[PDB]
Design a binder for this molecule. Structure first.
Ligand SMILES: NC(=O)c1ccc[n+]([C@@H]2O[C@H](COP(=O)([O-])OP(=O)(O)OC[C@H]3O[C@@H](n4cnc5c(N)ncnc54)[C@H](O)[C@@H]3O)[C@@H](O)[C@H]2O)c1
Ligand code: NA
Length: 167
C-alpha cells in the first residue's frame, strides 16, 4: 500500500512534516515528489530540487522515519496539465492513493480515476511556504516554522542571503 504526496517544498516545513507522519499511519511507503523541480532562485521557488532533496532527507531522518518508508523523486513541471498525471506515473513506483491539498492536483488525479485525500491542514496560517519565505525576507521568525534540520540546511546553503538578494 503506497501513497503519493506532491509538493514544491519551498522549503519543507512543519506542515509537510505533520501531514507525512499521519500519511505514514495509513500506507506502508510514501512516494514524495518534489514538484517544480526545474525552478530555483526566485522569490516563490528559491531552492533547487537537490537542496530540497537534502531538506527532506535530513528532516525525515531527524524525525526517525526510516528511509525504506519513502521515496524522494524530483519532478519537473510540464506544459500540459492534461499529461501531468501520466508524467508522475512514468517517473514513480506504482501507487494506490494520492494525498494533496492542491485543487489542480486533486482535480487531475480525480479525473484520472484516483481517490484523492485532502488531509486536514496543520496550522494553515503559519505552516505555508509563502509565510516561511515572507518571514525570511522581512526578518520574521521563520525558523520556528521549520524542523531544525531544515533550518541547518538553509544556513549551510545561504538560503536567506539568496532570497533577500533576489528580492
Ligand atoms: N503541469 C504540471 O507541470 C503540473 C500540474 C499540477 C501540479 N504540478 C506541481 O505540483 C506541485 C505543487 O505542489 P504544491 O503547490 O501543493 O506544494 P506545497 O509544498 O505548497 O504543498 C504540498 C502539499 O503538502 C501538504 N501541506 C502543505 N502545507 C500543509 C500544512 N500546513 N498542513 C498540512 N498539509 C500541508 C498539502 O497536501 C499540499 O498540497 C508544484 O511543483 C506544481 O507545479 C505540476
Ligand atoms: Na512550498
Amino acid at each position: 500500500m503506497r501513497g503519493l504526496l506532491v509538493g514544491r517544498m519551498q522549503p519543507f516545513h512543519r506542515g509537510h512534516l505533520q501531514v507525512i507522519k499521519s500519511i505514514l499511519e495509513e500506507v506502508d511507503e510514501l512516494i514524495i515528489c518534489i514538484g517544480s523541480a526545474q525552478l530555483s532562485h526566485s522569490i516563490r521557488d528559491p531552492f533547487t530540487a537537490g537542496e530540497r532533496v537534502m531538506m527532506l532527507t535530513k528532516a525525515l531522518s531527524e524525525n526517525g522515519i526510516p528511509a525504506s518508508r519513502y521515496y524522494i523523486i524530483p519532478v519537473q513541471d510540464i506544459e500540459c496539465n492534461a499529461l501531468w498525471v501520466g508524467h508522475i506515473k512514468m517517473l514513480t513506483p506504482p501507487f494506490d492513493r494520492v494525498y494533496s491539498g492542491n485543487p489542480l492536483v486533486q482535480r487531475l488525479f480525480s479525473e484520472d480515476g484516483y481517490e484523492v485525500t485532502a488531509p486536514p491542514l496543520f496550522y494553515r496560517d503559519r505552516y505555508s511556504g509563502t509565510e516561511v519565505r515572507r518571514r525570511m525576507l522581512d526578518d520574521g521568525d521563520w525558523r520556528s516554522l521549520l524542523p531544525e534540520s531544515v533550518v541547518e540546511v538553509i544556513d549551510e546553503i545561504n538560503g536567506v542571503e539568496r532570497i533577500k538578494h533576489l528580492a
